[PDB]
Design a protein around this ligand. Sequence first.
Ligand SMILES: CS(=O)(=O)N(CC(N)=O)C1CCCCC1
Ligand code: NI
Length: 341
Amino acid sequence: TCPFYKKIPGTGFTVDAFQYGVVEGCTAYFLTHFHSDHYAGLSKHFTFPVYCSEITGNLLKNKLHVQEQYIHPLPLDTECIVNGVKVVLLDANHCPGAVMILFYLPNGTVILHTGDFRADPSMERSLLADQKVHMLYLDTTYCSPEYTFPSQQEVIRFAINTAFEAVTLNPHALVVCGTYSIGKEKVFLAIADVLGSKVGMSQEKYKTLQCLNIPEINSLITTDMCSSLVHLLPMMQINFKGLQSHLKKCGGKYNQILAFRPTGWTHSNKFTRIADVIPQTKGNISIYGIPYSEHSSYLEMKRFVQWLKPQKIIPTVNVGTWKSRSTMEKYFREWKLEAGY
Ligand SMILES: CS(=O)(=O)N(CC(N)=O)C1CCCCC1
Ligand code: NI
């Protein structure tokens, strides 16, 4: 049974709704981004129209093997008509290819679905500036004031400086970065750039990255592990056992590992500053957890919503408990009373 918050009223449209079989009345299925909780259910046998970004379309075709005739890519920042309804895709500042969707309903209502997003003041000068939005379907992942983290720029500065220092001190150190989905590519690309290396990875991860329209990508990544001193591994292998095992396979080329686990928020944000972050260490292996978020902080979310001034908000994350739902509704009312809308 498809839940109400994945349906767009007054249309034949759903958003991120592929795990419910054939949804009654759905003439077009929108996909905001290529993360498994959102695409769950799509495969080579899907036979309905899918609307998405070009990058998402590349991943559907090459990784899930969806047939080309059912993939409908749309350009960003461009008014398009889909099954008689005007829509616009906007950059979500999430992972590559991720979008927000603006729907202009036949009755005059305007709906924004954020998909997953990291709110930014730059969104205040998109096509959102032009008109009123009545309903907002909101990525509420971190909708509580305890959720603080630094800018992406500050986290990358920390990672670059940390990696460059370690490898300049010991030229026989290897850098490893964890991954389990698309997103957060800047972490490993920025470290490899400062070290003058390509990023080495499996054939499967190389395939994924080749779908993302990143400029000059062939100059930045490789499947030749022996040529690279920055390696990507599955996130599950970023632990002392898994890294010890990987070091053995490198044939005495290296005598130290510096590893990075880009998490979302963790409780150590409530205590510590980014500059003060320290690794976990056992012998010649050190592991850094770095708070690189592709979701809005509480303050970023609050600013976006108080700017947009929607008439109704529908959360799309943390919807499963009465405590979470009550907490979110209390913040939405606070924000409106403070701003005066
Ligand atoms: C826009 S708001 O004031 O924050 N809001 C809560 C919400 N979920 O939109 C409600 C206001 C009263 C009518 C239902 C909507
Ligand atoms: Ni996501």
